[PDB]
RNA sequence: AGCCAGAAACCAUGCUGAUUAAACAAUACUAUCUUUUUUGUUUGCUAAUGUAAAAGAGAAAUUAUAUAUGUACCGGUACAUAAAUAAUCCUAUCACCUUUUUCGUGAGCUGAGCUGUGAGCUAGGCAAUAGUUCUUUAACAACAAAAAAGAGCACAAACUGUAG
RNA sequence: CAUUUUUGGUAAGCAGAACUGGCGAUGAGGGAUGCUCCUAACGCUUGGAUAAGGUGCCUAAAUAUUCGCUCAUGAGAUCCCAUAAAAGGUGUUGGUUCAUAUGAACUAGCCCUGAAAAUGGAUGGCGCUAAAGCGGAUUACCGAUACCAAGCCAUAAAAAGAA
RNA sequence: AAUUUAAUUUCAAUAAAGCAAUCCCCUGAAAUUGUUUUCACUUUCUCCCCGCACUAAUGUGGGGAAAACUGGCUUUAUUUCU
């Protein structure tokens, strides 16, 4: 028979399974889509969280019961050394989904994105990238005309430069950022233009700009049901623990369905 | 002649009487014509009858004659009208067909095949009251009215249709339904 | 069953009629619609020089027999239209409210304004190659005319889907825009 | 594509005097399909010498057609 | 049966038929590239295949969804799981069968200069009559969101002007041909000459 | 299938198997009639160890006839040999097991001068 | 070019199937271009040969062979029932099967 | 028959997973390595074989289906062209060496001269011969030996704690 | 337990009988799947030709022929056997009766409405609309441990026998 | 792939003659079963008249005639022209 009493299901589905990410980096899965019109520019940028601190803002919003007053509210601050660009990608729709064409490289590139590539930079002898980096200008320009041609979609590869920050590590953090603009020729003259030089947050957001915030979330381990999923306990008398759900299904089907949740991790989780 | 087109059913002419007795001296004699798939399907249904209409069966009676009728002219049409009486699920009714065709035979072929596709009938729900050829000008129904049009022509317009021989599993380009 | 079914259509004065392949195109001084056929057995004939168009079918069904005359009203509607463009008066109504009726974008885009005291904009674009004119005349007239019949009605029948009141009754209240008298320019 | 101007009423008789009379099948013969049909008889019914012959016959022509070919530049 | 690779242009093919066909070639050993899948027609009205995808999508494993039917949107895909559920796929000469099939919508670059064969027995001019409604799977497709349709469209387009610029010039080099064919005819022994002109060649 | 060779045809090879022998270790694989209330087995179910009987039995003009032509005699004295002198071309000698190899080879020389085919023949040398 | 056939194209198809019974005396054969029990029924006194290969060698070669009849045209579509001296072994379903000239 | 607007519904978009696709691409750097020829693959080992498909496995227009396609003018117009379409077309056997003569390409020199290789014409006299069939050993790919020719990472350890 | 006959019970894969056949104790081929339905009852084999049933693919035989009917925004599809009715329908198809090439009235085929249930989901599945649907007819074919011919085995009887 | 003499209302040409015109082989519709009589039924690549290009139609809608080419019959020969 149906329960006696009805309320929404405790925890969403729409984050199931509930598995540890892949990568500490964050990912975007989708970029804004290419208006047309707009000029050439960035749509991303990478950071590094300080912390929270309060701010004291007076709200102009009329109609309100707060009105005219100022508000105290918190805030993050995330430092942003600025962001050096190194690759240029061109991608191609296909029905089987975007393919890469080629990817054209700067003339250098810093220490601190070579050590990204390996996994033991004090042990290595430090030989990657050289003999590429090297290839003539002409090589370069074949390239980058076989990207003008064809590519429709043309990502910046970018990192950053932790020696600019008070953090630990010293392999950078890599990311691609998509280019959305104007004509083909226009978002590869940009990025030409912009290639080995270093790129401020002034030169991708404004002033009072409404932003998406892309991060891994804080860990905990393994947690029990009720913190991983906010189960309300059972009475206190019960024989084998109290901390944990009191069903995990029904008789028929004669399998746990999959909906109930158990115990298990919690945090380090994707999140936009 | 083509085993594929060919049907089976045939006009058989039938007669018989009742066995003499001493109260039956010369008894009335009958005969009849009967559409059947063989002589003696034919015998089975003019005894069908004789039991139905006379007061008769098999065993107290004799067969006078029984001979073949075939048409006359196979070869040039005729407008066959047919009368039948059949059973439906609920009851029973009394109808009135027309039919182009080049044999009596022919004719009661195709009824058969109506009668199945319109209206359900089984072999043994259909019984033949009267079927004779009748003339142009008087023709009830309207698809056979438009047949007897003093220059009939028409284009084809039905999809090919050939041997097992070229009836293969894959072709050079897409055929084409047009025809010239 | 039946073997033949035709109809014969006469062609107006002023058209250039253009078939092929069941793909109809009308042209003429108001304007060129093309309109397809070729969902349809159907063996429309042409005849240019003497005018008039045959429209013949072999082997319909009462099916067809429907088809052959729609076909062939539906053309002469089209003939009518190059002609002579099709005008539909639509009368807008009100009780209490006065309806503003705003004609803009080179009378595309009629908006309509303060249908029953809303405070409220209901914009309805029009079907390309309509023209929505207001009336010289009698002030709650609109003007929907073209060269399509097809086109004016769905944008008369829009705008007149567009404006109609939700949840009281209709008996009673009468407010909005109708379909007063279908007419040519 | 064919037709004769026969009357609807024809028996065989009439028919076989008006069919040759007026040629009809010399027409049919004479068009593509029918010369197409009359080469396959032939084609399919062919012995084991004409078989070979006519590859002989098309090895030379090629032999022709190559070095004209090869003359032309 | 007997040839290596059957190319098959799936256009204005009749979805299960072309399937069934297909399948049983394929369990006869003949390899088969399916392309151009867009274009394969189900048979009726939309509504009513949408009606019934939107069914056998809605069908779902209770407990873990991960072990569910598989749905699939893709063209292509479909007539795989078709041609897929033809054949015995569970036993071992059942699984080659079904390994020996490969499908793609539009027509990839290996398959561009090999001939396009059709199944006549398949067409659907030729089974569906004509005032019977009928129905594009690429539409079919793009409603229930496989989202792929304007791509292949954009695709098949270039590839026609390919074509044309080819069939172009091979035009003209068989009229080549034929031209030095003609004028070296009368470079041949009467008696060979004479057989060849028998047989009209 | 049926096993041809010349004059003698077997029926069936593959010794009959006792039901059940293949997946339990204590069941003996020697044959053994199923009772069972039901079974497969003595029910006859389709593919499934299909049980001996008679009409299998080799034809009764070459019952016993090895693929020697001969009839096979076992021996195991020189005594035991006399009659067989007289039936060279139709039986033929085993040397019994047990015996012993100088024996053994006492009976092998009498047969080899008899005229008589010795089938296990190179036994214990 | 060297070495041309002398012998017509064919597919080996399954056993003598019925619906879930099977009989192994008896292969079923496609042959290159029949499609007819009359077709079909010009090749039935005719010689087959299944030539296969295996690893290393038996009799010194690669190749092993073995022989057939066909015996009687099967269906309406110009199948045909091959009856061998050992039975086919099933593994060469959808392989080459040789049916030659002779006699 | 043809259409249109229209819902917390449906599907995307979005967001999460993707050793759920035994999936996959690009790129950086690297380990005798690559090509041709020859012979072979008839202490656990220290030379080494496999084919679900060779016997001519021949065939790139493209679009309809109650019409198509070129071409020419400006989707319209005109004129051709396909209309049992693979029921077609293609494509193979003229060995040998020698005599005569014609035409293509690779290589050496600065549109030309020469040699090798491919194709043809002309003339010669020259080979095949296992006792009746028992697969017509002929394909593709893989390898090993032999000559000849060219050429650094990761894990651990210590450290970390954004992780556990 | 099934047909047919049948008594109780609202009915029941319910209770109780009658006749016969089964099943039980019985495989094999078909009915997708199944103790009872259909076919047919079984020594071991070789070849032949079928039954019951099928012949788009799964799946061996026909994408057979021939004339009809049928579109379904919850079609339909195989005895037992795996539900569907009363009542409607200006859906199409035939009829039949009336009236002055139409209006009336009836009728029965398919089809539609009536037609609501819980794990996901079942014409056996994929699928099918110029059917692979429904109703026929026509062929041809495929198809058993049954049938025919032949071999071999045992059993039973019979002939028949005391250099 | 065929085949013999039967039987069963089979036929069809051939090439010379003839016969009848809504005629004929037939088949319709009419005045304890025969039988006879009335008028009904063919073509057309023919002609004429109206509609004059009106058609789906290299023709046509309607209304009239014409003929025996075509069909049907009677004879006389003939059967590998078929």
Same mark, same amino acid.
């Given at each position: 028979?149906?329960?006696?009493?009805?309320?929404?299901?405790?925890? /969403?589905?729409?984050?199931?399974?509930?598995?540890?990410?892949?990568?500490?980096?964050?990912?975007?899965?989708?970029?804004?889509?290419?208006?047309?019109?707009?000029?050439?520019?960035?749509?991303?940028?990478?950071?590094?969280?300080?912390?929270?601190?309060?701010?004291?803002?007076?709200?102009?919003?009329?109609?309100?019961?707060?009105?005219?007053?100022?508000?105290?509210?918190?805030?993050?601050?995330?430092?942003?050394?600025?962001?050096?660009?190194?690759?240029?990608?061109?991608?191609?729709?296909?029905?089987?989904?975007?393919?890469?064409?080629?990817?054209?490289?700067?003339?250098?590139?810093?220490?601190?994105? $070579?050590? $990204?590539?390996?996994?033991?930079?004090?042990?290595?002898?430090?030989?990657?990238?050289?003999?590429?980096?090297?290839?003539?200008?002409?090589?370069?320009?074949?390239?980058?005309?076989?990207?003008?041609?064809?590519?429709?979609?043309?990502?910046?590869?970018?990192?950053?430069?932790?020696?600019?920050?008070?953090?630990?590590?010293?392999?950078?953090?890599?990311?691609?950022?998509?280019?959305?603009?104007? /004509?083909?020729?226009?978002?590869?003259?940009?990025?030409?233009?912009?290639?080995?030089?270093?790129?401020?947050? /002034?030169?991708?957001?404004?002033?009072?700009?409404?932003?998406?915030?892309?991060?891994?979330?804080?860990?905990?381990?393994?947690?029990?049901?009720?913190?991983?999923?906010?189960?309300?306990?059972?009475?206190?008398?019960?024989? $084998?623990?109290?901390?944990?759900?009191?069903?995990?299904?029904?008789?028929?089907?004669?399998?746990?369905?999959?909906?109930?949740?158990?115990?298990?991790?919690?945090?380090?989780?994707?999140?936009? | 002649?083509?085993?594929?087109?060919?049907?089976?059913?045939?006009?058989?002419?039938?007669?018989?009487?009742?066995?003499?007795?001493?109260?039956?001296?010369?008894?009335?004699?009958?005969?009849?014509?009967?559409?059947?798939?063989?002589?003696?399907?034919?015998?089975?249904?003019?005894?069908?009858?004789?039991?139905?209409?006379?007061?008769?069966?098999?065993?107290?009676?004799?067969?006078?004659?029984?001979?073949?009728?075939?048409?006359?002219?196979?070869?040039?049409?005729?407008?066959?009208?047919?009368?039948?009486?059949?059973?439906?699920?609920?009851?029973?009714?009394?109808?009135?067909?027309?039919?182009?065709?080049?044999?009596?035979?022919?004719?009661?072929?195709?009824?058969?095949?109506?009668?199945?596709?319109?209206?359900?009938?089984?072999?043994?729900?259909?019984?033949?009251?009267?079927?004779?050829?009748?003339?142009?000008?008087?023709?009830?129904?309207?698809?056979?009215?438009?047949?007897?049009?003093?220059?009939?022509?028409?284009?084809?317009?039905?999809?090919?249709?050939?041997?097992?021989?070229?009836?293969?599993?894959?072709?050079?380009?897409?055929?084409?339904?047009?025809?010239? | 069953?039946?073997?033949?079914?035709?109809?014969?259509?006469?062609?107006?004065?002023?058209?250039?009629?253009?078939?092929?392949?069941?793909?109809?195109?009308?042209?003429?001084?108001?304007?060129?619609?093309?309109? @397809?056929?070729?969902?349809?057995?159907?063996?429309?004939?042409?005849?240019?020089?003497?005018?008039?168009?045959?429209?013949?079918?072999?082997?319909?069904?009462?099916?067809?027999?429907?088809?052959?005359?729609?076909?062939?009203?539906?053309?002469?509607?089209?003939?009518?239209?190059?002609?002579?463009?099709?005008?539909?008066?639509?009368?807008?109504?009100?009780?209490?409210?006065?309806?503003?009726?705003?004609?803009?974008?080179?009378?595309?885009?009629?908006?309509?304004?303060?249908?029953?005291?809303?405070? @409220?904009?209901?914009?309805?674009?029009?079907?390309?190659?309509?023209?929505?004119?207001?009336?010289?005349?009698?002030?709650?007239?609109?003007?929907?005319?073209?060269?399509?019949?097809?086109?004016?009605?769905?944008?008369?029948?829009?705008?007149?889907?567009?404006?109609?009141?939700?949840?009281?009754?209709?008996?009673?209240?009468?407010?909005?825009?109708?379909? @007063?008298?279908?007419?040519?320019? | 594509?064919?037709?004769?101007?026969?009357?609807?009423?024809?028996?065989?008789?009439?028919?076989?005097?008006?069919?040759?009379?007026?040629?009809?099948?010399?027409?049919?013969?004479?068009?593509?399909?029918?010369?197409?049909?009359?080469?396959?008889?032939?084609?399919?019914? %062919?012995?084991?010498?004409?078989?070979?012959?006519?590859?002989? %016959?098309?090895?030379?022509?090629?032999?022709?057609?190559?070095?004209?070919?090869?003359?032309?530049? | 049966?007997?040839?290596?690779?059957?190319?098959?242009? !799936?256009?204005?093919?009749?979805?299960?038929?072309?399937?069934?066909?297909?399948?049983?070639?394929?369990?006869?050993?003949?390899?088969?590239?399916?392309?151009?899948?867009?274009?394969?027609?189900?048979?009726?009205?939309?509504?009513?295949?949408?009606?019934?995808?939107?069914?056998?999508?809605?069908?779902?494993?209770?407990?873990?969804?991960?072990?569910?039917?598989?749905?699939?949107?893709?063209?292509?895909?479909?007539?795989?799981? !078709?041609?897929?559920?033809?054949?015995?796929?569970?036993?071992?000469?059942?699984?080659?069968?079904?390994?020996?099939?490969?499908?793609?919508?539009?027509?990839?670059?290996?398959?561009?200069?090999?001939?396009?064969?059709?199944?006549?027995?398949?067409?659907?001019?030729?089974?569906?009559?004509?005032?019977?409604?009928? !129905?594009?799977?690429?539409?079919?497709?793009?409603?229930?969101?496989?989202?792929?349709?304007?791509?292949?469209?954009?695709?098949?387009?270039?590839?026609?002007?390919?074509?044309?610029?080819?069939?172009?010039?091979?035009?003209?080099?068989?009229?080549?041909?034929?031209?030095?064919?003609?004028?070296?005819?009368?470079?041949?022994?009467?008696?060979?000459?004479?057989?060849?002109?028998?047989?009209?060649? | 299938?049926?096993?041809?060779?010349?004059?003698?045809? *077997?029926?069936?090879?593959?010794?009959?198997?006792?039901?059940?022998?293949?997946?339990?270790?204590?069941?003996?694989?020697?044959?053994?009639?199923?009772?069972?209330?039901?079974?497969?087995?003595?029910?006859?179910?389709?593919?499934?160890?299909?049980?001996?009987?008679?009409?299998?039995?080799?034809?009764? *003009?070459?019952?016993?006839?090895?693929?020697?032509?001969?009839? *096979?005699?076992?021996?195991?004295?020189?005594?035991?040999?006399?009659?067989?002198?007289?039936?060279?071309?139709?039986?033929?000698?085993?040397?019994?097991?047990?015996?012993?190899?100088? *024996?053994?080879?006492?009976?092998?020389?009498?047969?080899?001068?008899?005229?008589?085919?010795?089938?296990?023949?190179?036994?214990?040398? | 070019?060297?070495?041309?056939?002398?012998?017509?194209?064919?597919?080996?198809?399954?056993?003598?199937?019925?619906?879930?019974?099977?009989?192994?005396?008896?292969?079923?054969?496609?042959? =290159?271009?029949?499609?007819?029990?009359?077709?079909?029924?010009?090749?039935? #006194?005719?010689?087959?040969?299944?030539?296969?290969?295996?690893?290393?060698?038996?009799? #010194?070669?690669?190749?092993?062979?073995?022989?057939? =009849?066909?015996?009687?045209?099967?269906?309406?579509? #110009?199948?045909?029932?091959?009856?061998?001296?050992?039975?086919?072994?099933? =593994?060469?379903? #959808?392989?080459?099967?040789?049916?030659?000239?002779?006699?």
């Amino acid at each position: 028979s149906h329960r006696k009493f009805e309320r929404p299901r405790h925890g /969403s589905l729409g984050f199931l399974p509930r598995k540890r990410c892949k990568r500490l980096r964050g990912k975007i899965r989708s970029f804004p889509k290419d208006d047309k019109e707009k000029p050439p520019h960035f749509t991303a940028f990478m950071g590094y969280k300080a912390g929270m601190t309060h701010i004291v803002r007076e709200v102009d919003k009329p109609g309100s019961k707060l009105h005219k007053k100022e508000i105290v509210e918190a805030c993050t601050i995330i430092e942003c050394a600025p962001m050096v660009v190194v690759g240029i990608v061109g991608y191609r729709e296909t029905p089987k989904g975007l393919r890469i064409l080629s990817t054209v490289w700067a003339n250098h590139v810093s220490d601190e994105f $070579r050590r $990204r590539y390996y996994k033991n930079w004090y042990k290595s002898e430090k030989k990657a990238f050289t003999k590429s980096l090297n290839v003539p200008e002409a090589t370069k320009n074949c390239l980058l005309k076989r990207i003008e041609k064809y590519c429709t979609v043309l990502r910046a590869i970018c990192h950053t430069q932790p020696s600019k920050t008070p953090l630990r590590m010293k392999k950078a953090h890599i990311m691609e950022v998509q280019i959305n603009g104007g /004509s083909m020729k226009e978002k590869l003259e940009f990025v030409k233009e912009m290639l080995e030089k270093n790129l401020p947050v /002034s030169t991708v957001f404004n002033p009072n700009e409404m932003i998406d915030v892309i991060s891994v979330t804080k860990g905990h381990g393994t947690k029990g049901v009720v913190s991983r999923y906010g189960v309300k306990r059972l009475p206190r008398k019960t024989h $084998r623990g109290l901390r944990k759900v009191a069903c995990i299904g029904a008789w028929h089907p004669a399998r746990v369905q999959f909906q109930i949740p158990r115990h298990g991790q919690k945090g380090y989780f994707h999140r936009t | 002649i083509d085993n594929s087109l060919n049907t089976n059913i045939h006009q058989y002419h039938i007669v018989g009487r009742a066995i003499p007795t001493a109260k039956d001296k010369n008894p009335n004699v009958y005969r009849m014509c009967i559409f059947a798939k063989n002589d003696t399907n034919a015998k089975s249904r003019f005894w069908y009858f004789m039991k139905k209409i006379n007061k008769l069966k098999k065993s107290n009676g004799e067969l006078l004659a029984c001979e073949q009728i075939k048409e006359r002219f196979p070869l040039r049409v005729k407008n066959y009208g047919v009368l039948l009486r059949y059973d439906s699920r609920t009851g029973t009714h009394n109808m009135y067909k027309e039919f182009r065709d080049t044999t009596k035979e022919g004719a009661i072929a195709q009824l058969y095949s109506e009668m199945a596709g319109r209206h359900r009938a089984r072999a043994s729900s259909i019984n033949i009251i009267r079927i004779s050829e009748i003339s142009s000008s008087l023709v009830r129904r309207p698809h056979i009215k438009q047949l007897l049009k003093r220059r009939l022509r028409f284009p084809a317009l039905h999809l090919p249709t050939l041997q097992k021989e070229y009836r293969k599993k894959f072709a050079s380009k897409r055929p084409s339904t047009y025809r010239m | 069953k039946t073997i033949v079914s035709t109809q014969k259509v006469l062609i107006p004065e002023g058209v250039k009629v253009a078939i092929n392949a069941r793909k109809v195109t009308v042209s003429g001084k108001y304007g060129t619609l093309r309109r @397809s056929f070729r969902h349809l057995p159907i063996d429309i004939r042409l005849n240019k020089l003497k005018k008039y168009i045959k429209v013949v079918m072999w082997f319909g069904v009462p099916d067809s027999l429907a088809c052959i005359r729609t076909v062939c009203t539906h053309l002469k509607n089209m003939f009518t239209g190059v002609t002579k463009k099709f005008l539909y008066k639509m009368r807008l109504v009100h009780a209490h409210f006065p309806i503003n009726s705003n004609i803009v974008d080179n009378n595309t885009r009629i908006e309509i304004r303060n249908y029953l005291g809303e405070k @409220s904009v209901r914009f309805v674009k029009a079907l390309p190659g309509v023209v929505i004119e207001k009336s010289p005349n009698v002030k709650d007239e609109i003007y929907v005319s073209g060269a399509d019949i097809e086109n004016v009605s769905l944008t008369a029948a829009l705008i007149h889907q567009s404006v109609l009141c939700r949840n009281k009754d209709i008996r009673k209240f009468l407010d909005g825009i109708y379909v @007063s008298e279908v007419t040519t320019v | 594509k064919e037709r004769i101007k026969i009357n609807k009423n024809c028996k065989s008789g009439f028919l076989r005097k008006t069919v040759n009379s007026t040629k009809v099948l010399e027409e049919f013969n004479n068009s593509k399909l029918g010369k197409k049909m009359i080469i396959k008889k032939k084609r399919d019914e %062919a012995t084991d010498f004409e078989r070979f012959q006519v590859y002989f %016959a098309k090895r030379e022509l090629k032999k022709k057609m190559t070095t004209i070919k090869n003359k032309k530049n | 049966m007997y040839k290596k690779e059957y190319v098959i242009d !799936c256009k204005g093919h009749l979805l299960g038929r072309l399937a069934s066909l297909i399948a049983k070639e394929l369990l006869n050993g003949q390899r088969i590239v399916a392309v151009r899948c867009e274009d394969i027609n189900i048979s009726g009205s939309l509504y009513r295949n949408k009606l019934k995808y939107q069914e056998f999508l809605r069908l779902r494993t209770n407990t873990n969804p991960k072990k569910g039917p598989l749905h699939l949107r893709e063209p292509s895909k479909i007539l795989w799981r !078709c041609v897929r559920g033809m054949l015995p796929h569970k036993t071992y000469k059942g699984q080659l069968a079904l390994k020996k099939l490969k499908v793609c919508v539009g027509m990839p670059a290996p398959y561009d200069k090999k001939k396009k064969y059709v199944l006549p027995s398949a067409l659907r001019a030729f089974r569906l009559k004509k005032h019977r409604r009928y !129905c594009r799977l690429g539409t079919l497709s793009s409603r229930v969101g496989w989202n792929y349709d304007t791509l292949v469209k954009k695709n098949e387009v270039l590839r026609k002007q390919v074509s044309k610029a080819y069939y172009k010039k091979k035009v003209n080099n068989l009229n080549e041909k034929k031209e030095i064919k003609t004028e070296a005819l009368n470079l041949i022994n009467p008696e060979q000459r004479q057989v060849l002109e028998n047989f009209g060649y | 299938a049926v096993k041809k060779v010349g004059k003698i045809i *077997k029926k069936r090879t593959k010794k009959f198997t006792r039901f059940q022998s293949n997946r339990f270790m204590r069941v003996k694989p020697a044959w053994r009639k199923p009772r069972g209330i039901d079974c497969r087995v003595r029910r006859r179910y389709k593919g499934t160890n299909l049980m001996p009987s008679i009409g299998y039995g080799s034809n009764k *003009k070459t019952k016993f006839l090895l693929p020697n032509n001969k009839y *096979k005699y076992v021996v195991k004295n020189v005594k035991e040999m006399e009659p067989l002198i007289m039936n060279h071309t139709k039986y033929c000698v085993q040397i019994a097991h047990n015996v012993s190899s100088k *024996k053994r080879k006492q009976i092998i020389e009498r047969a080899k001068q008899m005229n008589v085919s010795v089938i296990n023949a190179k036994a214990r040398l | 070019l060297q070495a041309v056939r002398l012998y017509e194209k064919g597919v080996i198809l399954g056993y003598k199937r019925s619906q879930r019974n099977q009989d192994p005396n008896f292969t079923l054969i496609s042959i =290159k271009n029949v499609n007819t029990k009359k077709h079909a029924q010009f090749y039935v #006194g005719k010689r087959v040969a299944y030539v296969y290969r295996t690893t290393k060698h038996h009799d #010194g070669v690669k190749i092993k062979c073995i022989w057939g =009849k066909v015996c009687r045209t099967h269906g309406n579509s #110009g199948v045909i029932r091959a009856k061998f001296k050992t039975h086919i072994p099933p =593994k060469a379903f #959808g392989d080459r099967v040789r049916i030659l000239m002779y006699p």
